[PDB]
Amino acid sequence: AYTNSFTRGVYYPDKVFRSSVLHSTQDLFLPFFSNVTWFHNPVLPFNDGVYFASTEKSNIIRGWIFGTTLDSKTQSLLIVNNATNVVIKVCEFQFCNDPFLGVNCTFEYVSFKNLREFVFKNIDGYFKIYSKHTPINLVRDLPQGFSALEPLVDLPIGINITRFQTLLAYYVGYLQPRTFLLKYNENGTITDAVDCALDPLSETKC
Amino acid sequence: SFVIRGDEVRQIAPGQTGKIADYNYKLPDDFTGCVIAWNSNNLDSKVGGNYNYLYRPLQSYGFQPTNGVGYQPYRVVVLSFATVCGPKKSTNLVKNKCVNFNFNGLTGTGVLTESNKKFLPFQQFGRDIADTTDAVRDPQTLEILDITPCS
Ligand SMILES: *[C@@H]1O[C@H](CO)[C@@H](O)[C@H](O)[C@H]1NC(C)=O
Ligand SMILES: *[C@@H]1O[C@H](CO)[C@@H](O)[C@H](O)[C@H]1NC(C)=O
Ligand SMILES: *[C@@H]1O[C@H](CO)[C@@H](O)[C@H](O)[C@H]1NC(C)=O
Ligand SMILES: *[C@@H]1O[C@H](CO)[C@@H](O)[C@H](O)[C@H]1NC(C)=O
Ligand SMILES: *[C@@H]1O[C@H](CO)[C@@H](O)[C@H](O)[C@H]1NC(C)=O
Ligand SMILES: *[C@@H]1O[C@H](CO)[C@@H](O)[C@H](O)[C@H]1NC(C)=O
């Protein structure tokens, strides 16, 4: 099952205020109109960065696991929100064959009707997390539109990640190094974007 | 952190020899760090003899407050040496003057004046059209100050 990722997957590349300027930047983004895998805890890889989009009505998805083996062999990232606080641990946890939620440690931190988008990337040992929450009224697939994901969590994990899994519909994307032209309004937010590798019209615009 | 005798405190050093450095706490020859020790004759030593500290099969040390300086128990903590950085002291901020400012990520010379910009909560610096810094956010007070270049 695959759905159409029209114009979503765009986040703020840095913490720099830009106003009334069209800025060209090069970073890892989800391609426009690309195929994203549609799910209704499979093993998924972490090749170059993963865009995560989930639609919730009763808070089914609780968190994610990041690592390479995730079988108590090396350090693995455990980000679990148990309905009251977000808990992040990077211990070498021993995971079950089918982890699910019912109804050596170096770092530890404790904090359809809705759409929750997430971007996970690990560059130079730093885990960058971008997110954006918005209300929706749609069931079949992701809504068509544009939105920007702000950074909230920066983890200096220093841990190699090659495989992730989702703990509990959601969509999985992938990021590739393509150039983007970002439109900044007077308030410093991103209102539109152009994928420079989409079509020759987008190439001309870039 | 360990408790050793006063005479054996000198054995906690790179390239050192002795019973402690041979069988209890061995240090690397190219070790990087600091060694801090202090006397604990009024804390760990006992009148009847505090034999709770053992060293190498193992023998206990007769720590007493009536003993000598070399026989007094000493608490030694060795800090072996990125997430653990040193502290950064900040200074007062003066506005409307040509100053050499030093913020979190950038340095420069300019005049800091009150701005009317509306930064996003996650944004720390502002940029102009020509890729130059025009406004920054103060790391202590959540305010935005324009950087006017000096005349
Ligand atoms: C993947 O995307 C291409 C467009 O590049 C489309 O033609 C194809 O049908 C998509 N595949 C699936 C399984 O949706
Ligand atoms: C969530 O988990 C953390 C530890 O992982 C625990 O300290 C906390 O109490 C839990 N919260 C709830 C509501 O169970
Ligand atoms: C932690 O790592 C050490 C290696 O430094 C290993 O000897 C030990 O068994 C590990 N413990 C756990 C609980 O993984
Ligand atoms: C990650 O992989 C590289 C090899 O490309 C290796 O040098 C490094 O030690 C690994 N990091 C961890 C935390 O295992
Ligand atoms: C900026 O935000 C203000 C609300 O504080 C709003 O009135 C204004 O229309 C916004 N401007 C833009 C360009 O989004
Ligand atoms: C630093 O502490 C002062 C209290 O003197 C407070 O007013 C200020 O908001 C604090 N700044 C941050 C970034 O926490």
Curated annotation (Swiss-Prot), chain B:
Attaches the virion to the cell membrane by interacting with host receptor, initiating the infection. The major receptor is host ACE2. When S2/S2' has been cleaved, binding to the receptor triggers direct fusion at the cell membrane. When S2/S2' has not been cleaved, binding to the receptor results in internalization of the virus by endocytosis using host TFRC and GRM2 and leading to fusion of the virion membrane with the host endosomal membrane. Alternatively, may use NRP1/NRP2 and integrin as entry receptors. Residues 82-101 are annotated as: Disordered. Changing L54R: In strain: Delta/B.1.617.2, Epsilon/B.1.427/B.1.429, Kappa/B.1.617.1, Lambda/C.37, 19B/501Y, Omicron/BA.4, Omicron/BA.5, Omicron/BQ.1.1; Contributes to cellular immunity evasion and increases infectivity. Binds to host ACE2. RBD also interacts with the N-linked glycan on 'Asn-90' of ACE2. Cleavage of S generates a polybasic C-terminal sequence on S1 that binds to host Neuropilin-1 (NRP1) and Neuropilin-2 (NRP2) receptors. Interacts with host integrin alpha-5/beta-1 (ITGA5:ITGB1) and with ACE2 in complex with integrin alpha-5/beta-1 (ITGA5:ITGB1). May interact via cytoplasmic c-terminus with M protein. May interact (via N-terminus) with host bilirubin and biliverdin, thereby preventing antibody binding to the SARS-CoV-2 spike NTD via an allosteric mechanism. Changing K19T: In strain: Gamma/P.1. Disulfide bonds join C98-C150. Changing R10S: In strain: Omicron/BA.2, Omicron/BA.2.12.1, Omicron/BA.2.75, Omicron/BA.4, Omicron/BA.5, Omicron/BQ.1.1, Omicron/XBB.1.5, Omicron/EG.5.1. This is Spike protein S1. The chain holds residues 399 to 591 of 1273 of the full protein. Residues 5-7 are annotated as: Integrin-binding motif. Changing N67Y: In strain: Alpha/B.1.1.7, Beta/B.1.351, Gamma/P.1, Theta/P.3, Mu/B.1.621, 19B/501Y, Omicron/BA.1, Omicron/BA.2, Omicron/BA.2.12.1, Omicron/BA.2.75, Omicron/BA.4, Omicron/BA.5, Omicron/BQ.1.1, Omicron/XBB.1.5, Omicron/EG.5.1; May enhance affinity to human ACE2 receptor. Changing Y55F: In strain: B.1.1.298. Changing Q64R: In strain: Omicron/BA.1, Omicron/BA.2, Omicron/BA.2.12.1, Omicron/BA.2.75, Omicron/BA.4, Omicron/BA.5, Omicron/BQ.1.1, Omicron/XBB.1.5, Omicron/EG.5.1. Residues 50-56 are annotated as: Immunodominant HLA epitope recognized by the CD8+. Changing T107K: In strain: Omicron/BA.1. Changing V47P: In strain: Omicron/XBB.1.5, Omicron/EG.5.1.
